[PDB]
Design brief:
The structure is cut from a larger assembly and holds 1 copy of chain A (105 residues), 3 copies of chain B (40 residues) and 1 copy of chain C (129 residues).
Chain A lengths: L7 E2 L10 E3 L9 E5 L6 E2 L16 E5 L2 E5 L10 E8 L4 E4 L4 E2 L1
Parallel strand pairs in A: 1-9
Antiparallel strand pairs in A: 2-6, 3-4, 3-7, 5-6, 7-8
Chain B lengths: L2 E8 L8 E8 L4 E2 L5 E2 L1
Antiparallel strand pairs in B: 1-2, 3-4
Chain C lengths: L2 E5 L9 E2 L2 E5 L8 E6 L5 E6 L19 E4 L4 E4 L1 E2 L8 E7 L3 E4 L3 E4 L3 E4 L9
Antiparallel strand pairs in C: 1-3, 2-8, 3-7, 4-5, 4-9, 6-7, 9-12, 10-11
The chains are: A mainly beta (105), B mainly beta (40), C mainly beta (129).
Bound molecules: 2-acetamido-2-deoxy-beta-D-glucopyranose (3 copies).
């Protein structure tokens, strides 16, 4: 069981980012997104595809249906110039797999 | 402070999966658990 | 607000062993499960190991199941992950991350444990040879 | 596809622990969830 | 070696939440799994 994240994405300031965490039949599994900044440890931003933790910028939402798990961003700003990773727990294969990330402009 | 609309995270099948459903309950039906948290 | 601190990384050689100490505070380990991942440069995240409060649900990833062991204790509230038989393609920054440990119980199905990291440590270092 | 062989995760003497066990079912006994996954 | 005091957790008011609890059981009431582990 593996993920199929895009290799890179370019979103200029003021636009919306459509990052996707590809996965076969991912609608049957929860997806948790992370921000992997360079020089410091990652911080969880989304869990269960709808909830949201404290101490987070507002308007961070994600959608998980069908064969693709999509993360939604608005008013993109340079502070979020890092890589995004999505985590999924699998019991049939009995292991946790992380995607390859996606570079941001 | 009479009608409350919200959803509860419960699973029907797919043991390692969680999906929410929205239901409406009266204020007196649900008591506070603590902010913005309630319980049957 | 919780903090995780790790120490003990230094130069290593293939076939050797290293003792890694990872203490933490702010959340009790009695009902907390600790994870382990590594971040090689230019690559994505990789799962390393999992551990429960005492035992069971200590599952390991497919590629790192050889002779890797993880142990926990309640007396001093710390964790270890000793490196053994280091390969030439397993060098990266190993990260230990806290887990919320949410669960669920249905009379028919039984206990179901969900896993997703909540807190993360500063990070360790590894250098083969 | 007269008979299909496969396994599932089931509870054991300890409720928290679980085991993997294999069993045989007829094709018409089970139905496909969608690949390679089925339910009774 | 006649009465053992120890801890565990099981169901609580809310299915998702957990609570660690302690109780005293007689030596012959429980049986070891194997060290410092037992069950009814
Ligand atoms: C089903 O089990 C087989 C082991 O024989 C494995 O190769 C396969 O990936 C499993 N399928 C899924 C969807 O996990
Ligand atoms: C059992 O509980 C005691 C309580 O202090 C703890 O020290 C011990 O580590 C627990 N058992 C195991 C195997 O860790
Ligand atoms: C029994 O074990 C518990 C461990 O949960 C401990 O807190 C307690 O002090 C022990 N003694 C008694 C009399 O409960």
């Amino acid at each position: 069981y593996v993920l199929t994240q895009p290799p890179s994405v370019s979103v200029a300031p003021g636009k919306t980012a459509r990052i996707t965490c590809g996965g076969n039949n991912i609608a049957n599994k929860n997806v948790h997104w992370y921000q992997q900044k360079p020089g410091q440890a990652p911080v969880l931003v989304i869990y269960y595809d709808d909830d949201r933790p404290s101490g987070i910028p507002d308007r961070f939402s994600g959608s998980n249906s069908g064969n693709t798990a999509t993360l939604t961003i608005s008013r993109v700003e340079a502070g979020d110039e890092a890589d995004y990773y999505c985590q999924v727990w699998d019991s049939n294969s009995d292991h946790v797999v992380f995607g390859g990330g996606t570079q941001l402009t | 402070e009479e009608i409350k609309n919200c959803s509860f995270k419960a699973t029907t099948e797919l043991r390692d999966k969680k999906r929410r459903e929205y239901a409406l309950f009266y204020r007196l039906d649900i008591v506070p658990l603590s902010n913005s948290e309630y319980r049957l | 607000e919780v903090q995780l601190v790790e120490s003990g990384g230094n130069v290593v050689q293939p076939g050797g062993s290293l003792r890694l100490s990872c203490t933490a505070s702010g959340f009790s380990f009695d009902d907390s499960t600790m994870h382990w991942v590594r971040q090689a440069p230019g690559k994505g995240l990789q799962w390393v190991s999992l551990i429960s409060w005492n035992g069971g649900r200590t599952y390991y990833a497919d590629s790192v199941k050889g002779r890797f062991t993880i142990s926990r204790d309640n007396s001093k509230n710390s964790l270890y992950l000793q490196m053994n038989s280091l390969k030439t393609e397993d060098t990266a920054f190993y990260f230990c991350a806290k887990d919320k440990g949410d669960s669920d119980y249905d009379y028919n199905l039984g206990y179901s444990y969900f896993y997703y990291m909540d807190g993360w440590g500063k990070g360790t270092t590894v250098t083969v040879s």
